[PDB]
Design a protein around this ligand. Structure first.
Ligand SMILES: Nc1nc2c(ncn2[C@@H]2O[C@H](COP(=O)(O)OP(=O)(O)CP(=O)(O)O)[C@@H](O)[C@H]2O)c(=O)[nH]1
Ligand SMILES: [Mg+2]
Lengths: 50, 50, 342, 198, 329, 101
């Protein structure tokens, strides 16, 4: 099929576009989680821990 | 830490406001009334018995 | 009303202990043509001769009856609005006082007053309930009646049956044509679907011999959401001969078993009373989720109050160190100008 | 003939309940299965009972996540609380006891956070609104199937109770997540963000 | 000239295309009817009357989308069980606000009326009423059905109790001010609006004298075939086309024009320019005093919510308007 | 204005009240009967003239034993109707007969 291949190409474009949106968000999301749950946490906890 | 962190002061300095304790106690006691309102809900069930 | 007395009392406390208003029971309003048996129906719901009764025209001035539950604080007594706090342990005086008061405004010549009579009845074996005894529907202006007395009484009926929160008892005599029941005809003006209207067929013992109301009772002629229930009760002679309830039951039961064997156990006044109890139970059931909803809402509120302190602290040491740390941190941050509290 | 007609009528009445159920176990499991199936289908919008009515079950939550929630957030700030003069005070405080050659980045780094904190409330409200709708699915579910469960009213209500228990079990979990999500935004500001330049 | 400019200004800035006006009026009715049906099913327990479209769209000329469609929701209170009280008479002493008092509890106890769901202490809660009805509009109402039915995008606002037509297929956009209020009087004018007071008691109500003011200006014009409302319409468009006057709304202009209306001058179209400048002078003077007492209630200063310096600046802007009349047009 | 009272006796008494409650350094006891409408409490109404926020004003509800049967002041007591910084406290006390007895 050819028409369906063209429809598949549309799907591929939708996949790429949405994926990149998601990935872009992840690029900021993770760092923040690490800072929040690990870095900033122990930054304050350690004193009481020690 | 040197002044306040003593094992005796963990009982002394760490004394809760009674007014605060009573305020929250009342909230708990009203919640206990709502635990009693599970018997109201039991009564809700009982009203289906007729 | 029987076990409902303690059931309902428990179901008052369900509101008292949450700070809610107690569910109000629908107003009991009896409608129908003159001498259909209206007051008698209400009398069977009390057990006392509190209402006036008789042939032709009797009720000539709507009665507002407030049944009153009495606590453990006269065992049984009444009280009229127009006599303030006068207590009536004499329940014949009550009936007679209704008669007196009726004549005072409506008169004693078939005239009907638009000004109802308010009466409270007190007992520790009854539950709070509002009931209305209406004048019978008419067509001809007689005695002291106005040209539009039909419409006056119609409006007097509508005054009460127009309230969704009510039970309309369509009391019509068995020896009349139920298909023309004025009781139901006016009921349909405020309750066209019959959702809160119960069809009542009285004087089955006087029903025209050779005929029946099976088609009416079975909904073939008259469809009613609350069903159709027949009634047997005392005549002029049986009232004057003081026929007992047991005697009335025997005659009712035997008649009904001989008349409608299969419907006899639905017509049976006891069945009706139980049905009415069920209707009230349904009325109660309708708002039990609202009751439960409040319980849920309050719980969230009380937990929110509990969240105001969070915990009582069983760790002590770590808690203290954290409190110290946080203070010193923000203290030093305040020096820097880097405090969270800017 | 009448005898025959009546028999059909009475059997038709008997067909209103079908059976008294002597299997119990399988019956219960079927009743549970059917409920849960249609319950989940109602969430999907793929339920057999597609009675045309008020928006509920599925796309009502879509509504919550757009027409309610999305719009709610659109109404928030973005310049709310930004009194120029108060900010000038704030950046003087940000400098602190020292002298400065230029204004600290602390400035917006805290002022933004104040506005971010305002985004926690309506987010949690959204969660609560969904929780309500999840309960409304039961009300929707009670419009059908129940007629079989009217043969076991007690079961019927027990099912409902269990469902809402589960909902309440998962409620605070989501609340914690959403709280955390806001905290994550508060945790760090990325001035190198691809959409952020000046 | 000013006279000529005002005449053109009406045609160019007051008039909002009749097609949009007619469509707006149609949708006003359609939305009302949908909400009537919805409230019948959503609040069958409450005695809501038929909802009434009104406001500038009807009250004047082709206002169209220039201002809100006013939609009355009739809170038919049970006569005798509820009574009107002045806010100032209560601990929450605010004469501008009003309270609805529950009474006759000795014959009809709380729980007997459907409006007792809003009963707090012994008063009807405008606040809780608003909370439930705004929630109904916010989510409960099937706006996808409304949009599908009417061929448009209609949704709820994010403030007060207003609705937004994001776009009717026939190139129309507009907003609806839903006014939930007690019928009030047999004149079909004064209403008890479910007011959203944030301070004091939020259960308090607002005495709605809008249609009273509108009827008064109508009557004043009908007394001598005058053009008081035409001046108002011109002033409205002037405010729409002047950001300096963004603090002065229809209500502000109404109070000024009511004061103007109570006079015996040349009220014909030929003296629009004269009365325009007179309107400016009256308004500016009020601005110079930082005081605009409502015509039907002088204790209400409509400039009290505005900054004195900004008030004066508005007067200065309008003063330059006096200097160059046509510059406001 | 009754008996020997002046036309503005209301205002006279009002000013006599203000003479004392206008002082920040005071405790204002807003004493109003339970069988009257607390929402219209003149006690509180005048208190708000000198203490609009209620910072030194305590709401007092007396004659609870005479409160109109079937009604309550729970909403007042719980601050649902009347918010008071010092709270709202009800009172039961002697009637004419109980004083004389
Ligand atoms: N045989 C018989 N008589 C009955 C029955 N019910 C009522 N009656 C008789 O009918 C008459 C009317 O009874 P009543 O209860 O006063 O009727 P009512 O409809 O209230 C009269 P009004 O319309 O004037 O109020 C009385 O004489 C009473 O004895 C019944 O079921 N059977
Ligand atoms: Mg009678």
């Amino acid at each position: 099929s050819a028409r369906e291949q063209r429809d598949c190409e549309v799907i591929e474009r939708l996949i790429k576009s949405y994926f990149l949106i998601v990935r872009k968000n992840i690029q900021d999301s993770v760092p923040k989680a690490v800072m929040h749950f690990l870095v900033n946490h122990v930054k304050d906890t350690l004193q009481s821990e020690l | 830490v040197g002044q306040l962190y003593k094992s005796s002061l963990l009982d002394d300095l760490l004394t809760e406001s009674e007014d605060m304790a009573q305020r929250r106690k009342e909230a708990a006691d009203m919640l206990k009334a709502l635990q009693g309102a599970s018997q109201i809900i039991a009564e809700i069930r009982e009203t289906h018995l007729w | 009303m029987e076990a409902l007395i303690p059931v309902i009392n428990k179901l008052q406390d369900v509101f008292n202990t949450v700070g809610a208003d107690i569910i109000q029971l629908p107003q009991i309003v009896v409608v129908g043509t003159q001498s259909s048996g209206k007051s008698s129906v209400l009398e069977s719901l009390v057990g006392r001769d509190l209402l006036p009764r008789g042939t032709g025209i009797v009720t000539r001035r709507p009665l507002i009856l407030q049944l009153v539950h009495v606590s453990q604080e006269a065992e049984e007594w009444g009280k009229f609005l127009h006599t303030k706090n006068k207590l009536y342990t004499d329940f014949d005086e009550i009936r007679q006082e209704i008669e007196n008061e009726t004549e005072r405004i409506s008169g004693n010549n078939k005239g009907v007053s638009p000004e109802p009579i308010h009466l409270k009845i007190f007992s520790p074996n009854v539950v709070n309930l509002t009931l209305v005894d209406l004048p019978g529907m008419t067509k001809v202006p007689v005695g002291d009646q106005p040209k539009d007395i039909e419409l006056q009484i119609r409006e007097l009926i509508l005054r009460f049956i127009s309230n969704p929160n009510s039970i309309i008892l369509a009391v019509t005599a068995a020896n009349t044509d139920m298909a023309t029941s004025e009781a139901l005809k006016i009921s349909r003006e405020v309750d066209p679907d019959g959702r809160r209207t119960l069809a009542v067929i009285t004087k089955l013992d006087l029903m025209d011999a050779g005929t029946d109301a099976m088609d009416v009772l079975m909904g073939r002629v008259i469809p009613v959401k609350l069903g159709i229930i027949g009634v047997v009760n005392r005549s002029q002679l049986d009232i004057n001969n003081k026929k007992s309830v047991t005697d009335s039951i025997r005659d009712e039961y035997a008649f009904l078993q001989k008349k409608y064997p299969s419907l006899a156990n639905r017509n049976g006044t006891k069945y009706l009373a139980r049905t009415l109890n069920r209707l009230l139970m349904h009325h109660i059931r309708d708002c039990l989720p609202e009751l439960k909803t409040r319980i849920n809402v309050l719980a969230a509120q009380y937990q929110s109050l509990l969240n105001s302190y969070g915990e009582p602290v069983d760790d002590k040491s770590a808690t203290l160190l954290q409190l110290i740390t946080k203070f010193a941190t923000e203290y030093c941050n305040t020096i820097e100008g880097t405090a969270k509290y800017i | 003939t009448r005898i025959n007609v009546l028999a059909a009528q009475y059997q038709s009445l008997l067909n209103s309940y079908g059976e008294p159920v002597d299997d119990k176990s399988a019956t219960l499991l079927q009743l549970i299965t059917k409920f849960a199936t249609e319950y989940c289908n109602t969430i999907e919008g793929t339920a057999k009972y597609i009675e045309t009515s008020e928006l509920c079950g599925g796309a009502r939550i879509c509504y919550i996540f757009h027409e309610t929630f999305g719009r709610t957030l659109e109404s928030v700030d973005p310049l709310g609380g930004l009194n120029t003069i108060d900010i000038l005070t704030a950046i003087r405080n940000a400098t602190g006891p020292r002298p400065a050659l230029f204004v600290p980045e602390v400035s917006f780094e805290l002022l933004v956070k104040r506005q971010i904190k305002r985004l926690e409330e309506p987010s949690l409200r959204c969660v609560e609104l969904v929780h309500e709708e999840m309960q409304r699915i039961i009300q929707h579910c009670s419009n059908y199937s129940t007629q079989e469960l009217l043969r076991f009213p007690k079961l019927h209500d027990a099912i409902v109770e269990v469902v809402t228990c589960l909902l309440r079990k998962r409620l605070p979990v989501t609340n914690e997540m959403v709280h955390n999500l806001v905290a994550i935004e508060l945790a760090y500001i990325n001035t190198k963000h691809p959409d952020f330049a000046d | 000239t000013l006279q000529e400019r005002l005449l053109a200004f009406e045609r160019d800035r007051v008039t909002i295309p009749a097609a949009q006006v007619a469509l707006a009026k149609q949708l006003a009715g359609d939305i009302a009817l949908e909400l009537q049906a919805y409230f019948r099913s959503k609040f069958p327990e409450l005695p809501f009357g038929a909802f009434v479209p009104g406001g500038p769209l009807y009250d004047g000329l082709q206002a169209g989308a220039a201002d809100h469609v006013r939609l009355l929701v009739p809170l038919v209170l049970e006569p005798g069980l509820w009574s009107l009280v002045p806010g100032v008479d209560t601990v929450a002493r605010d004469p501008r606000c009003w309270a609805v008092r529950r009474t006759q509890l000795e014959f009809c106890p709380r729980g007997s009326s459907p409006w007792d769901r809003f009963l707090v202490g012994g008063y009807l809660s405008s606040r809780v009423l608003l909370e439930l009805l705004r929630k109904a509009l916010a989510a409960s109402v099937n706006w996808p059905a409304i949009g599908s039915l009417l061929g448009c995008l209609i949704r709820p606002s994010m403030a007060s109790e207003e609705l937004l037509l994001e776009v009717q297929h026939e190139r129309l956009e507009l907003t609806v001010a839903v006014l939930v209020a007690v019928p009030g009087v047999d004149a079909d004018d004064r209403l008890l609006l479910a007011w959203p007071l944030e301070g004091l008691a939020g259960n308090l109500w607002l005495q709605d004298l809008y249609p009273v003011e509108a009827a008064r200006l109508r009557a004043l014009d009908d007394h001598d075939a005058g053009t008081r409302r035409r001046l108002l319409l011109l002033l409205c468009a002037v405010c729409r086309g002047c950001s300096a006057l963004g603090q002065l709304g229809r209500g502000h202009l109404t109070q000024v024009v009511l004061r103007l209306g109570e006079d015996n001058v040349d009220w014909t179209e030929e003296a629009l320019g004269e009365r325009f400048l007179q309107a400016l002078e009256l308004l500016i003077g009020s601005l110079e005093q930082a005081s605009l007492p409502c015509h039907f209630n002088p204790s209400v200063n409509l400039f009290s919510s505005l900054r004195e310096e900004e008030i004066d600046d508005i007067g200065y802007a309008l003063y330059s308007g006096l200097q160059e009349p046509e510059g406001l047009l």
